[PDB]
Amino acid sequence: SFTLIGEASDGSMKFVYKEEHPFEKRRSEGEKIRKKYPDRVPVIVEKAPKARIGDLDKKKYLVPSDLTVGQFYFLIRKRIHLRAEDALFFFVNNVIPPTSATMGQLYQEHHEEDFFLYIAYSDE
Amino acid sequence: NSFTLIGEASSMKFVYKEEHPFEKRRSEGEKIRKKYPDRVPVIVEKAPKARIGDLDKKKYLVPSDLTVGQFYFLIRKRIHLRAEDALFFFVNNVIPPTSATMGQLYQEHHEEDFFLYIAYSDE
Amino acid sequence: SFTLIGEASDGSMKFVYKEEHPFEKRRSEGEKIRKKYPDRVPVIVEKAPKARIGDLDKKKYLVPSDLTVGQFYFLIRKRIHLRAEDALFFFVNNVIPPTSATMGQLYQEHHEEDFFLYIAYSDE
């Protein structure tokens, strides 16, 4: 018989950052930081609820637009002290982006109206 | 000053297809696709040249929205191999992008028995 | 309250191989090896000076055209004796290729007039 492996991921990701700040406060912050750092993009990075890896101390990042998703994985891996064997996946609107995509490209395609890009992370 | 030659070049014949007749395969694939419409049936086999272990079970049902990269960890934990060992997956002898979904690979590449065949190897 | 993470690369990279071997000699060698091994591609692999990881002993490789970037990463990591936790990225003309790209496709796109493909590697 077949062996079932893996589970679908619910699209129900809520972000503490969106819960803790009204829209216009977020938009004002995102607009101002895009003016101050025009070669970076503001990204909210938060743990998916079924993730079985560590928490991030900070959620609000400023990442160079020209860095790839792959480069960003390593920078985040280092902050959650992941063992090399441990998985790490980013999801934007519940979809894992290609590792060769740049953060600027992802931001242009998927930032919200508050000027933030939202990324959930998980080990599965 | 001399060139250093490394790596080896790579169609694979899956022993599963020799072990089970086509019509029994197809009947099963059609049945399981109706039973689990949000999963895809996959046959996973080791490439003969791989120096890592074989899987006990070959037949898996994976969520269509799962990626190859996610699938990698679900299968790697079921193989006997060392941390130092590589693991690569092939569909029709090509390594897919890690962000490709299993449902997309199934839609493009499932055979006429409605299974997706995936090989794995080390390096 | 933003956390700056990662740095942009300014794209500066020279290859010691080119400094040390005249163009005409490089071109004749690359032409000759492509005739003899038509299913392999000649690659020069060098560490970016800014990288804080180990250097390679050998820089001139001859790899199957159908080998992927991912397969080549695994071999080069081993040759450098990289810690599992350290990152390794390849750059071709300052762009990280997709891990599923083949070396033959990168060679076709980016080999120079000496018939070599030049790859830099770094930890970031």
Numbering used by the authors:
A (entry chain C), C (entry chain A): -11 to 112
B (entry chain B): -12 to -3, 0 to 112
Sentences from the paper on this structure:
Initiation of macroautophagy/autophagy is mediated by the ULK1 (unc-51 like autophagy activating kinase 1) protein kinase complex and the autophagy-specific class III phosphatidylinositol 3-kinase complex I (PtdIns3K-C1). The latter contains PIK3C3/VPS34, PIK3R4/VPS15, BECN1/Beclin 1 and ATG14 and phosphorylates phosphatidylinositol to generate phosphatidylinositol 3-phosphate (PtdIns3P). Here, we show that PIK3C3, BECN1 and ATG14 contain functional LIR motifs and interact with the Atg8-family proteins with a preference for GABARAP and GABARAPL1.
This putative LIR motif is adjacent to the BH3 domain of BECN1 (amino acids F97-I100). The mutations significantly reduced binding and confirmed a functional LIR motif in BECN1. If that did not work we made a chimeric protein consisting of GABARAP N-terminally fused to the LIR sequence with a Gly-Ser linker. The LIR motif of BECN1 (FTLI) is also a canonical F-type LIR motif. In each of those 3 structures we observed some hydrophobic interactions between the residues C-terminal to the core LIR motif in position +4 to +6 (V255 [PIK3C3]-P256 [PIK3C3]; G101 [BECN1]-A103 [BECN1]; P439 [ATG14]-P441 [ATG14]) and HP2.
